[PDB]
Design a protein around this ligand. Sequence first.
Ligand SMILES: *[C@@H]1O[C@H](CO)[C@@H](O[C@@H]2O[C@H](CO)[C@@H](O[C@@H]3O[C@H](CO[C@H]4O[C@H](CO)[C@@H](O)[C@H](O[C@H]5O[C@H](CO)[C@@H](O)[C@H](O)[C@@H]5O[C@H]5O[C@H](CO)[C@@H](O)[C@H](O)[C@@H]5O)[C@@H]4O)[C@@H](O)[C@H](O[C@H]4O[C@H](CO)[C@@H](O)[C@H](O[C@H]5O[C@H](CO)[C@@H](O)[C@H](O)[C@@H]5O)[C@@H]4O)[C@@H]3O)[C@H](O)[C@H]2NC(C)=O)[C@H](O)[C@H]1NC(C)=O
Ligand SMILES: *[C@@H]1O[C@H](CO)[C@@H](O[C@@H]2O[C@H](CO)[C@@H](O[C@@H]3O[C@H](CO[C@H]4O[C@H](CO)[C@@H](O)[C@H](O[C@H]5O[C@H](CO)[C@@H](O)[C@H](O)[C@@H]5O)[C@@H]4O)[C@@H](O)[C@H](O[C@H]4O[C@H](CO)[C@@H](O)[C@H](O)[C@@H]4O)[C@@H]3O)[C@H](O)[C@H]2NC(C)=O)[C@H](O)[C@H]1NC(C)=O
Ligand SMILES: *[C@@H]1O[C@H](CO)[C@@H](O[C@@H]2O[C@H](CO)[C@@H](O[C@@H]3O[C@H](CO)[C@@H](O)[C@H](O[C@H]4O[C@H](CO)[C@@H](O)[C@H](O)[C@@H]4O)[C@@H]3O)[C@H](O)[C@H]2NC(C)=O)[C@H](O)[C@H]1NC(C)=O
Ligand SMILES: *[C@@H]1O[C@H](CO)[C@@H](O[C@@H]2O[C@H](CO)[C@@H](O[C@@H]3O[C@H](CO[C@H]4O[C@H](CO)[C@@H](O)[C@H](O)[C@@H]4O)[C@@H](O)[C@H](O)[C@@H]3O)[C@H](O)[C@H]2NC(C)=O)[C@H](O)[C@H]1NC(C)=O
Ligand SMILES: *[C@@H]1O[C@H](CO)[C@@H](O[C@@H]2O[C@H](CO)[C@@H](O[C@@H]3O[C@H](CO[C@H]4O[C@H](CO)[C@@H](O)[C@H](O)[C@@H]4O)[C@@H](O)[C@H](O)[C@@H]3O)[C@H](O)[C@H]2NC(C)=O)[C@H](O)[C@H]1NC(C)=O
Ligand SMILES: *[C@@H]1O[C@H](CO)[C@@H](O[C@@H]2O[C@H](CO)[C@@H](O)[C@H](O)[C@H]2NC(C)=O)[C@H](O)[C@H]1NC(C)=O
Ligand SMILES: *[C@@H]1O[C@H](CO)[C@@H](O)[C@H](O)[C@H]1NC(C)=O
Ligand SMILES: [Ca+2]
Ligand SMILES: [Ca+2]
Ligand SMILES: [Ca+2]
Ligand SMILES: [Ca+2]
Ligand SMILES: [Ca+2]
Ligand SMILES: [Ca+2]
Ligand SMILES: [Cl-]
Ligand SMILES: [Cl-]
Ligand SMILES: [Cl-]
Ligand SMILES: [Cl-]
Ligand SMILES: [Cl-]
Ligand SMILES: [Cl-]
Ligand SMILES: [Cl-]
Ligand code: NI
Lengths: 709, 964
Amino acid sequence: GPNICTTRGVSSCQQCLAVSPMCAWCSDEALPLPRCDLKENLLKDNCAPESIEFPVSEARVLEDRPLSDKGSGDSSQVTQVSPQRIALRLRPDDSKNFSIQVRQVEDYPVDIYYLMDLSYSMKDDLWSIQNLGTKLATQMRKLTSNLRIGFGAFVDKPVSPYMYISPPEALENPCYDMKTTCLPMFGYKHVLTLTDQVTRFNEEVKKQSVSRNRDAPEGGFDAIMQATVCDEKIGWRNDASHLLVFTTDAKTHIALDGRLAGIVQPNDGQCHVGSDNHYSASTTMDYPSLGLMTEKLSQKNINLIFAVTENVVNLYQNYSELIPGTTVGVLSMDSSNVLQLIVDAYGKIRSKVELEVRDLPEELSLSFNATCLNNEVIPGLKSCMGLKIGDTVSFSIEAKVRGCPQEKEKSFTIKPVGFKDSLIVQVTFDCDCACQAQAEPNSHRCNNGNGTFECGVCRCGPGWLGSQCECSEEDYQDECSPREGQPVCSQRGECLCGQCVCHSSDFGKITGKYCECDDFSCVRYKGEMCSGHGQCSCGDCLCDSDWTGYYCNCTTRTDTCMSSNGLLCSGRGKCECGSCVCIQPGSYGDTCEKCPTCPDACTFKKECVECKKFDRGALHDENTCNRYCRDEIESVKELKDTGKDAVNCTYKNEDDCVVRFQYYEDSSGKSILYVVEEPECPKGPAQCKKKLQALKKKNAQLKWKLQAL
Amino acid sequence: FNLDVDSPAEYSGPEGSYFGFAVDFFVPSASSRMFLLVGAPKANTTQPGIVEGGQVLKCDWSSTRRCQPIEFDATGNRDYAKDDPLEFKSHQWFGASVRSKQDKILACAPLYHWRTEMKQEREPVGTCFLQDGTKTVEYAPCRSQDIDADGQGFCQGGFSIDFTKADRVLLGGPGSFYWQGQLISDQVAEIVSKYDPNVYSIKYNNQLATRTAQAIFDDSYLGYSVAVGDFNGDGIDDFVSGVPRAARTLGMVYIYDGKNMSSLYNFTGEQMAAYFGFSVAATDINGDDYADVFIGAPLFMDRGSDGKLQEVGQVSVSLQRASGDFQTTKLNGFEVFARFGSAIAPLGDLDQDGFNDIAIAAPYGGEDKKGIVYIFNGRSTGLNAVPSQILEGQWAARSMPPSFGYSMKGATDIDKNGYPDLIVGAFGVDRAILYRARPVITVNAGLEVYPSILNQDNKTCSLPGTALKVSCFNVRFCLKADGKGVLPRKLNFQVELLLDKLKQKGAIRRALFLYSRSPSHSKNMTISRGGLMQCEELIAYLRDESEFRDKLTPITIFMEYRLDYRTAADTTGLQPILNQFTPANISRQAHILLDCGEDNVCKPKLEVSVDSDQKKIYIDDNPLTLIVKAQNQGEGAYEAELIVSIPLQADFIGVVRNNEALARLSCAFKTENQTRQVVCDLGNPMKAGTQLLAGLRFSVHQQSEMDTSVKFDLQIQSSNLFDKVSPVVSHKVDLAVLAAVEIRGVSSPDHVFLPIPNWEHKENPETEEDVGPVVQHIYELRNNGPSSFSKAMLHLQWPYKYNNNTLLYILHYDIDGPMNCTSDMEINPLRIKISSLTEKNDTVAGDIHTLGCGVAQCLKIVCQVGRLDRGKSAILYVKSLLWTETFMNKENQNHSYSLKSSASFNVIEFPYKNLPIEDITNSTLVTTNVTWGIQPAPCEKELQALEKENAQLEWELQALEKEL
Ligand SMILES: *[C@@H]1O[C@H](CO)[C@@H](O[C@@H]2O[C@H](CO)[C@@H](O[C@@H]3O[C@H](CO[C@H]4O[C@H](CO)[C@@H](O)[C@H](O[C@H]5O[C@H](CO)[C@@H](O)[C@H](O)[C@@H]5O[C@H]5O[C@H](CO)[C@@H](O)[C@H](O)[C@@H]5O)[C@@H]4O)[C@@H](O)[C@H](O[C@H]4O[C@H](CO)[C@@H](O)[C@H](O[C@H]5O[C@H](CO)[C@@H](O)[C@H](O)[C@@H]5O)[C@@H]4O)[C@@H]3O)[C@H](O)[C@H]2NC(C)=O)[C@H](O)[C@H]1NC(C)=O
Ligand SMILES: *[C@@H]1O[C@H](CO)[C@@H](O[C@@H]2O[C@H](CO)[C@@H](O[C@@H]3O[C@H](CO[C@H]4O[C@H](CO)[C@@H](O)[C@H](O[C@H]5O[C@H](CO)[C@@H](O)[C@H](O)[C@@H]5O)[C@@H]4O)[C@@H](O)[C@H](O[C@H]4O[C@H](CO)[C@@H](O)[C@H](O)[C@@H]4O)[C@@H]3O)[C@H](O)[C@H]2NC(C)=O)[C@H](O)[C@H]1NC(C)=O
Ligand SMILES: *[C@@H]1O[C@H](CO)[C@@H](O[C@@H]2O[C@H](CO)[C@@H](O[C@@H]3O[C@H](CO)[C@@H](O)[C@H](O[C@H]4O[C@H](CO)[C@@H](O)[C@H](O)[C@@H]4O)[C@@H]3O)[C@H](O)[C@H]2NC(C)=O)[C@H](O)[C@H]1NC(C)=O
Ligand SMILES: *[C@@H]1O[C@H](CO)[C@@H](O[C@@H]2O[C@H](CO)[C@@H](O[C@@H]3O[C@H](CO[C@H]4O[C@H](CO)[C@@H](O)[C@H](O)[C@@H]4O)[C@@H](O)[C@H](O)[C@@H]3O)[C@H](O)[C@H]2NC(C)=O)[C@H](O)[C@H]1NC(C)=O
Ligand SMILES: *[C@@H]1O[C@H](CO)[C@@H](O[C@@H]2O[C@H](CO)[C@@H](O[C@@H]3O[C@H](CO[C@H]4O[C@H](CO)[C@@H](O)[C@H](O)[C@@H]4O)[C@@H](O)[C@H](O)[C@@H]3O)[C@H](O)[C@H]2NC(C)=O)[C@H](O)[C@H]1NC(C)=O
Ligand SMILES: *[C@@H]1O[C@H](CO)[C@@H](O[C@@H]2O[C@H](CO)[C@@H](O)[C@H](O)[C@H]2NC(C)=O)[C@H](O)[C@H]1NC(C)=O
Ligand SMILES: *[C@@H]1O[C@H](CO)[C@@H](O)[C@H](O)[C@H]1NC(C)=O
Ligand SMILES: [Ca+2]
Ligand SMILES: [Ca+2]
Ligand SMILES: [Ca+2]
Ligand SMILES: [Ca+2]
Ligand SMILES: [Ca+2]
Ligand SMILES: [Ca+2]
Ligand SMILES: [Cl-]
Ligand SMILES: [Cl-]
Ligand SMILES: [Cl-]
Ligand SMILES: [Cl-]
Ligand SMILES: [Cl-]
Ligand SMILES: [Cl-]
Ligand SMILES: [Cl-]
Ligand code: NI
């Protein structure tokens, strides 16, 4: 039928291609009366096949390496992501779908650099980790056969007011007044480089000592930044798990806190540690901004862990939520449980895979459909939760470009947070026809050089309203209307030399073959056209990056639909246009987190027990039991009073047996299910005449007494 | 937008001295010589044995640009004893904060140290130096006999300072009291009159100060920034101070009374570490005379379109409502790491539009990360979101970033031009810049053409110079100008008019003036401010019919006007600028009538009609479609356009291009003056006998609390002389009340099993364990519908007892919502103590005989519900205990029951009085099944069979009895 390519793209080739990805242009020969039309339609018009300017959006895989089963092999390159390279070609306002797979391989080498607060309050903590290295090393044999470790230390910017300036014996020994003694003060110092030898570690722990400092908040961020950005001194290995552990019993200083000390220079994210193994810019440069820390951690692919005492757990909980790829754990005052915190934290990190994007053009946007287990598909989502080792995950991506940018080539990276391997997408844009380079300025083909000839058409200059730049106010007709029973150029113009001349309103630009398009016809959401998130073309709102819908008032975002628990709409709703659409009855709220009248917790977790422990139930049938029930669950001899918070639950299983268990919410922030191991089940194994008759009498009466209704 | 970036004045200082870290104007008043004040904290001074003592320079603005350091203290470090320095002025950062009012000037050294005057120590108490006219004294309130961290030893007073209209000083210091921070205020009079050089720790009769708080407030940094403004009745300026690390480093801003230093209001940041309260400022932007608050959060991170977090910084604008309830909005930065919101500078009324303006800086923004400052104009609604101007840094980073805009001060007319100016500074490059405001000229233009429609055969006026008569007409253009400040009253303008502008070179121009014989008129017109507009008119005509064949295209009359900026100068040559939003040009259009035949006079005869949808609009934003039929009965109509006046409740969502039958029309939204309009093109011209039918959509949300209907006024308009408009149709749409109110219920637990584990009967029950398990029935009344109801009632039927048996024993009942309830029976008569759980997690994700309150003794709880709006509810949590012995006694042994609790509601009133309120009611029940377990299967067989039948038959009869 009368497609738009005919009406909106008749002006020229470049314009034609911009009208729509489905539009084609005939750049050769001459057939008066649509140079811009569908590919097939142009074939019916006998346009030379090789003269058809019809680009095609495509995404070729430049490098496709197979994933690895194990990462301990030194005989081959480790691949955690596939494919690695993709060449992406795109048309103006077009889109293409491609995919990417990620896997956490087994026996993957690890880098662990220890960083401890050496404030006097942490004096004891140092003595407790003297044997930590090896004690943990043995515990890490099971997780991997390849591991390197090192050590670093920090106190705070060695300057007033944080440091004792007087007396002179204070700066040398801040514990001069204190019992015994203590080291001077320093921002940060490197001790041991990441090495495969665990022995040299414990030797350095003894070698290092403790220092005191006024004002409890410390300068850990300086140490974090430097340890991250400094690759050589720390010795981070490629194709290895980068783990940075941060231990402190007190608060932390933040950016702009330096102005009190007279520091006005922002952190540059550059390594200033020298051969002296100390932070040089400690005193000169201000604390790093969280955005900067996030950036560098992301770049260097470092997983940051917060080992913090109960009192500050909450403070670092909120902080961690601002920096992806980071966990929070409770470090005991004696720093004894640190070893456990390590193994557990590692599990949390490898239980989740998150994707990040680098160097993405402003004109380019992306969409996602996350596939975690089996047929599970989660639109808009770019990460997955609750995973294990050797587990593979997939993501269906769709790239949509707004317009056709100037630059020829761009390269943006899509990678898992913390992982070295990645997918580099090389994107190009076809904004022009090949015949444009063959254009002929003021060629004799158009009214003796009064017009330019390109792509098999004469684009005439001002003054000539006819093709070939012939007629100017002469006697001619053609078709200025779609049909003889319709007006002329929509009364936005008239027929001159057999063509429509669009007017120009103060509102916008009237364009199109029959002057049917403009910039102001588009719909308006609330006070703005296309919600301001789109630009109007012939009454059509073209949504900008990360915007969709007819009115472009629907975002592609998802994070606003995430709940505190880390679930989409609390699993009781689906995210639509950024806001959760609650499904579960009696549930509502931003993330559908509020559900007063929905069944009690016991009713929800009875399915989890029935699946995890009994390998059955409606939950088990859908194979969602593993991701749903994240609660640690164990079989107990008897149900005990763990807390006023704990709730004793009871239910009858499919075997008609009474099952008892309880749910605990708290105790440092982890949920556990305790199920009684022995559910109660069914037990396997004259005068009587007067008794039967006695009941028979009653039955006769009772039956006869059935009446009324 | 009126600031002159053409040729601003630039001032410099010693490299590495941080020249331009702090800035302010110096106005001794009495209409006297002007100066700029620049602080250089790292400037090496002449003070003996003192390095980078810091200094504040007085830059001469007039003519030569030369900064002459003002020396407050020439001496070195005083001595506590022989070879025992009392103080340490090296690197004391003097000039880190500078403020000036009238002939008074105050500069501080936040890094000035102290010996404590007791033991040998170095404590940064900070000091300041006040200079008023002929007198110069040192002011250091934190320097006292209260020392160390716990005291003001580490105060660092003077970190931020400011004056009040009452000539009182507001000085803050973060370090006081383990870095809780502190605000100290003193009367300038006392500061100087109580000053004794021989006394290091001075006491002031009248001083306001914040006291030490709990240790939990340590490291809060109160006094990081300061600003002044009155937020209560009295004319006294009240204290405002940023507290960036307050609330687990979430950031806060404390406001204290200017009189008794009593806390008035508080603010808190949304994001941690964003440093909410880094900088604070106060000005009345909406001209309500109520000081409006501004808080900077340079490290704030908004979420990009992708949903990714990005540090753009943020500034919260809080308008002070007379009532006291601040209406606040947020403003995100425009670039990453630019740290937008580092400096907020009041500009006063910059464009003299009647609304104070303001400037916000992103010192590290802009390409090359030099620096950028955004300017924002205020108005009735408030501060205009988008900035009207942008300033760029002209210097790069040697090592330290230029930090252009890090410190700035505006709101002062130095050149006496009538407009305030702005001082911006970059300590990174040791430079400072002054921006003079240009005079703003508002202008009104007009263009008239009559008669618009033209009969080619008219031939009225005669073409001069010949015997030819041509069809002519009149053209009338007007220019009115006005402005404020210093400028020549007479303003010349270069005005150019072109006829048939649409036809450019290469194409014939169809119209030209009667005399010049050309479509070009060049006029030098000079007009004065006020209503002395001139407005000249000329006569133009149309060429003969036989000179062209195109009578269709409309002849566009174009006018352009531009003033001579050179002759509009004021003092040193400062060129003015037109109002930010003014049409650079305006144009009208004429037309040629034809085919009118005999009468040669076209009568449009336009009609318009709107079909009533019949669909009532319910009170959220409801979709509404309107059918429209516009027909042209008579001859052609030029510039035909459908004009519609919509009320305040209506927002135009767009035109309907979905339906084929409905002709797709182009329409736009236009708001002129206080009028609210929708314009749709009906074709230019709309030919004779043309009938169109289309539709328009709207999203409507009630404005007035009570309204019968919403009226719309529609009509068609044309540029014709006769019958140029159609009748006005008033179509009202009645508003309806729709409130889908449902009531939900649940039982927690929903199923109880017997017997009760380790339970024992008590002749005299005491605890919950003595009675039985906890059974909670929970009902929720929620209003989903768009409309809201003001009042409602809710009734509850509880299974109180059965044959004098307790059944469910209500211990207590809680409520969350407007609802208030009463029980007809005393709750928890036995006075059993409450133990088990209001908080947290709902985010986790014998046959059967029902005992209804109808068949069992009933306890009733009636409740009065308040107002419930869209998506709002009221909840009733009924906590009870299952009375075990009841189910262990009498007929209860092997039987299973379902305890039924019914609850119904009814809406009694609505907030909409002028509308036909419709009552609504529904009901719901909550069942708790009590069941026995482990008794399904293993003379005596037949015996047991009839025993179960018997028992069951007993209950069914007992039911029918009590049911009647
Ligand atoms: C804007 O934001 C601002 C910041 O958030 C808000 O400002 C806040 O305003 C509130 C409300 O007034 C303040 O709370 C008050 O805190 C007072 C603390 O006073 C300190 O200093 C005195 C000595 O001068 C001590 O006596 C205090 O007691 C300490 O020690 C005792 C035990 O001996 C302990 O109970 C205290 O908690 C406190 O201990 C802490 O501090 C010490 C160090 O001093 C630490 O070592 C220790 O570890 C603790 O950290 C304290 O040190 C307090 O006096 C005020 O008391 C009122 O309220 C309490 C409530 O229980 C009440 O008991 C008290 O007495 C009442 O009962 C008495 C009989 O028992 C009666 O005699 C009396 O008449 C009363 O009826 C008072 O009612 C008060 O709690 C915050 O301090 C303040 N924060 C800051 C930083 O300014 C502001 O409100 C907000 N504005 C707006 C508009 O929202
Ligand atoms: C109300 O009640 C609901 C339901 O109980 C609460 O929802 C819970 O929210 C918490 C977060 O507050 C969720 O914790 C997450 O845990 C996963 C870990 O992945 C899962 O699978 C792992 C496989 O290795 C396994 O190790 C984990 O086991 C841990 O957690 C369970 C409890 O579920 C505990 O019993 C174990 O001992 C372990 O401690 C777990 O099963 C984690 O990926 C989540 O993000 C973490 O990691 C990311 C990325 O590094 C990091 O950014 C985060 O900061 C975090 O460290 C998150 O920690 C938990 O899954 C939810 N529980 C359930 C069963 O749904 C909800 O919190 C309560 N609301 C309120 C406000 O009180
Ligand atoms: C054929 O063409 C001739 C020549 O143009 C034309 O004569 C014109 O008639 C018009 C309309 O009567 C005259 O315009 C008038 O001018 C006076 C001042 O001289 C105005 O006051 C009149 O109206 C006032 O109010 C109007 C309200 O809309 C305003 O538009 C206007 O500005 C005034 O405020 C009125 O407009 C005009 O004077 C002559 N032109 C000349 C040069 O003679 C004649 O009408 C045409 N004949 C036909 C049959 O159309
Ligand atoms: C979930 O169910 C669990 C199992 O029933 C509950 O465990 C119970 O926890 C409570 C405390 O919260 C205990 O209550 C105490 O009971 C003892 C009884 O012992 C006394 O009498 C015995 C003889 O019967 C004698 O041997 C002892 O010496 C004592 O003289 C009381 O003495 C206490 O004061 C207190 O009331 C229960 O004992 C305990 N029961 C069991 C079987 O473990 C748990 O409370 C439930 N969880 C929640 C929070 O709902
Ligand atoms: C105020 O006056 C003070 C008077 O002492 C100035 O003190 C000087 O400041 C510098 C640092 O800016 C001190 O640091 C020295 O730095 C050099 C390193 O510089 C190297 O390169 C330079 C050439 O660029 C070369 O000249 C040097 O030899 C080095 O090769 C060190 O080598 C020095 O040992 C020393 O650490 C100077 O010590 C100090 N100079 C004096 C006279 O002692 C201060 O800079 C002034 N501040 C301002 C803002 O004006
Ligand atoms: C981040 O800090 C906030 C407080 O600023 C914590 O919020 C508290 O969380 C506890 C439970 O851990 C609740 O009992 C309190 O009611 C909360 N207080 C407030 C004011 O919200 C929070 O726990 C910390 N991190 C997170 C988000 O868990
Ligand atoms: C009008 O007068 C100005 C001086 O006021 C002169 O500079 C200009 O050339 C004149 N414009 C024309 C082109 O008539
Ligand atoms: Ca510290
Ligand atoms: Ca006041
Ligand atoms: Ca105000
Ligand atoms: Ca203004
Ligand atoms: Ca000025
Ligand atoms: Ca007529
Ligand atoms: Cl708009
Ligand atoms: Cl779309
Ligand atoms: Cl849609
Ligand atoms: Cl001032
Ligand atoms: Cl908000
Ligand atoms: Cl947002
Ligand atoms: Cl109410
Ligand atoms: Ni003294």
